[PDB]
Amino acid sequence: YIDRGIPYRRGYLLYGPPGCGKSSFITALAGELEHSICLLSLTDSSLSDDRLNHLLSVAPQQSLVLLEDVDAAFGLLNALDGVASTEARIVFMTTNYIDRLDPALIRPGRVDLKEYVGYC
Amino acid sequence: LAMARKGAQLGLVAFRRHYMITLEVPARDRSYAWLLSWLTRHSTRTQHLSVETSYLQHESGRISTKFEFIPSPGNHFIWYQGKWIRVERNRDMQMVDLQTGTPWESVTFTALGTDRKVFFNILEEARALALQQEEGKTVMYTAVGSEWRTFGYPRRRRPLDSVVLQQGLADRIVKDIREFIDNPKWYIDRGIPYRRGYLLYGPPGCGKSSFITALAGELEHSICLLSLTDSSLSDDRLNHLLSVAPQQSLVLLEDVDAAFGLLNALDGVASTEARIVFMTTNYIDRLDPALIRPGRVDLKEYVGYCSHWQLTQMFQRFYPGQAPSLAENFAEHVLKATSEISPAQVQGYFMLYKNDPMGAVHNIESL
Amino acid sequence: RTQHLSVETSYLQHESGRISTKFEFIPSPGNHFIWYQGKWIRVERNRDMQMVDLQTGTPWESVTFTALGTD
Amino acid sequence: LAMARKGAQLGLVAFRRHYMITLEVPARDRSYAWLLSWLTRHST
């Protein structure tokens, strides 16, 4: 990645109905490959946008950042990427309804992969 | 009677040794470890050995052990260029060393001859293995309140040739900086402030900031950046910030067009040594006309939409070992089908074909 | 031409991850001889087990010049 | 006279040992405990 002038970043985004085991699967994958995780809820009044940028910029090493219920939010379109690209800043974003999603959350660089988990 | 003289003859032959034998002695201060790690790779059959571990226990409960091997106490023998060299790793009861909490652990090299040009090269070749491992990071800084702070952790410097602009700009800029930095005495004598600021301009999404941080990582400097589109910043504050920038660093100013005291704040009595400045902009039309005269803004360059050589170098750098004529035709197709493009948009369009060269060159018309 | 030598380094590690090593060379413990203006002068760099020197955390390391004459 | 030479012959045979015998030495730093817990399970 470094040679070809691309930021070291590859974010996924899961979506599906509620009560499917999403967060369980994420923390399981985190425990599998010897990483830690930090989660933040977007439905928190104390959070600000510039604050969010400062938070996601300085995430600790060897960790995945988790964003729950992104549908109820919308700067994130700008805050996901920046000059503050720390090494190995993977991101996970989960959602209960894909219909509310913005159309610019699938292009590469911001959101690499997309998958659908749902009824059995 | 004869005994005192036995001791005397031995005392006399001891002095004769000094003018033929050579020695060398560290004292457990920042050359022990280097000069004993070098003493492993040279022989590799060295019995009489010993151990040193490293066990740091990262966050997240990870464990990152290793081993590092050393020659034991006692004596050893080795064969450098022409001579035989004898090592003693002496260790004693002179132990109370609170600088390290452990015993003394002297090393001593000894050998014959008079040419002391041997042990010097030993030190140097040990310094080689000592220094080659650690890779120079590139620390970032950021403004808060009225001070600079270590925003984030260190990073991996990209190579200078990582991004590529229009042909010539990189070598030109780095040559100018090399001239400005290598010869400082040229400036102090002639009563000129030690300052030489550039200013880039062009369209958005061209790789400007990437090129700046790359150049910073190339020539062993750090950088601090400040955004002018910040309400917390004041003008007198800005003066205090830019006055007290740390040593061996470039200051970066993003989006100067949306600002306008800076006309006065760029220069002052507060000229610290080696206060280089970089200023980037998306539209040159909004610029004030007094941002080109020497002393304030030395050089000016234009980076923008791509060319023939640029896309070829991009395509050649992405995939190694493919048809060069294929990449030439790729750039030709992009040029004839697209009147203008950016490195950002081409990077985006080109990322969709990971390790699919033939695909990427067959799928041109999507633009 | 002073054989019987020893070493002292400096390794400070500036900010920005820079490294600024060097070397500085010293005469070893034991004895040495030298030739100033007219006389022969004898050096001893004596070092002992009188070691507990918390002002520096290391041993004592006395230097002594000696020579003849009265001037 | 013969004594200094007894010591000398012993000093000479001591060097011969170095090229046939092998050694290994820790120093109470993050391998003592491991390398002595292993030394229990092996013999019993």
From Swiss-Prot, chain B:
Top EC group: hydrolase
Regions of this protein lying in the Mitochondrial matrix compartment: 5-367
Residues binding ATP: 202-209
Residue numbers bearing the Phosphotyrosine modification: 153
GO BP: mitochondrial cytochrome c oxidase assembly; mitochondrial respiratory chain complex I assembly; mitochondrial respiratory chain complex III assembly
Classification via CDD domains: RecA-like_BCS1
Lineage: Eukaryota, Metazoa, Chordata, Craniata, Vertebrata
InterPro entries in the cross-refs: AAA+_ATPase (IPR003593), ATPase_AAA_core (IPR003959), ATPase_AAA_CS (IPR003960), BCS1_N (IPR014851), Mitochondrial_chaperone_BCS1 (IPR050747), P-loop_NTPase (IPR027417)
Task of the protein: Chaperone necessary for the incorporation of Rieske iron-sulfur protein UQCRFS1 into the mitochondrial respiratory chain complex III. Plays an important role in the maintenance of mitochondrial tubular networks, respiratory chain assembly and formation of the LETM1 complex.
Bilayer disposition of the protein: Single-pass membrane protein
EC number: 3.6.1.-
GO CC aspect terms: mitochondrial inner membrane; mitochondrion
Subcellular compartments: Mitochondrion inner membrane
Superkingdom of origin organism: Eukaryota
Name under which the protein is recorded: Mitochondrial chaperone BCS1
Protein family: Belongs to the AAA ATPase family. BCS1 subfamily.
Chief site of localization: mitochondrion
Subunit structure: Interacts with LETM1.
Catalytic reactions on record: ATP + H2O = ADP + phosphate + H(+)
Disruption phenotype: Mice show phenotypes similar to the human GRACILE syndrome caused by defects in respiratory in mitochondrial respiratory chain complex III assembly. After three weeks of age, mice develop growth failure, hepatic glycogen depletion, steatosis, fibrosis, and cirrhosis, as well as tubulopathy, lactacidosis and short lifespan.
Entry keyword annotation includes Transferase: no
UniProt keyword Transmembrane, yes or no: yes
Keywords from the UniProt entry: ATP-binding, Chaperone, Hydrolase, Membrane, Mitochondrion, Mitochondrion inner membrane, Nucleotide-binding, Phosphoprotein, Transmembrane, Transmembrane helix
Gene Ontology MF term list: ATP binding; ATP hydrolysis activity; mitochondrial protein-transporting ATPase activity
Curated annotation (Swiss-Prot), chain D:
Superkingdom as given in the UniProt entry: Eukaryota
Secretion signal span: none
Consequence of gene loss (knockout): Mice show phenotypes similar to the human GRACILE syndrome caused by defects in respiratory in mitochondrial respiratory chain complex III assembly. After three weeks of age, mice develop growth failure, hepatic glycogen depletion, steatosis, fibrosis, and cirrhosis, as well as tubulopathy, lactacidosis and short lifespan.
Localization in the cell: Mitochondrion inner membrane
Purpose: Chaperone necessary for the incorporation of Rieske iron-sulfur protein UQCRFS1 into the mitochondrial respiratory chain complex III. Plays an important role in the maintenance of mitochondrial tubular networks, respiratory chain assembly and formation of the LETM1 complex.
Family: Belongs to the AAA ATPase family. BCS1 subfamily.
Subunit structure: Interacts with LETM1.
Protein name per Swiss-Prot or TrEMBL: Mitochondrial chaperone BCS1
Organism, scientific name: Mus musculus (Mouse)
Shown chain mapped onto the complete sequence: 29 to 72 of 418
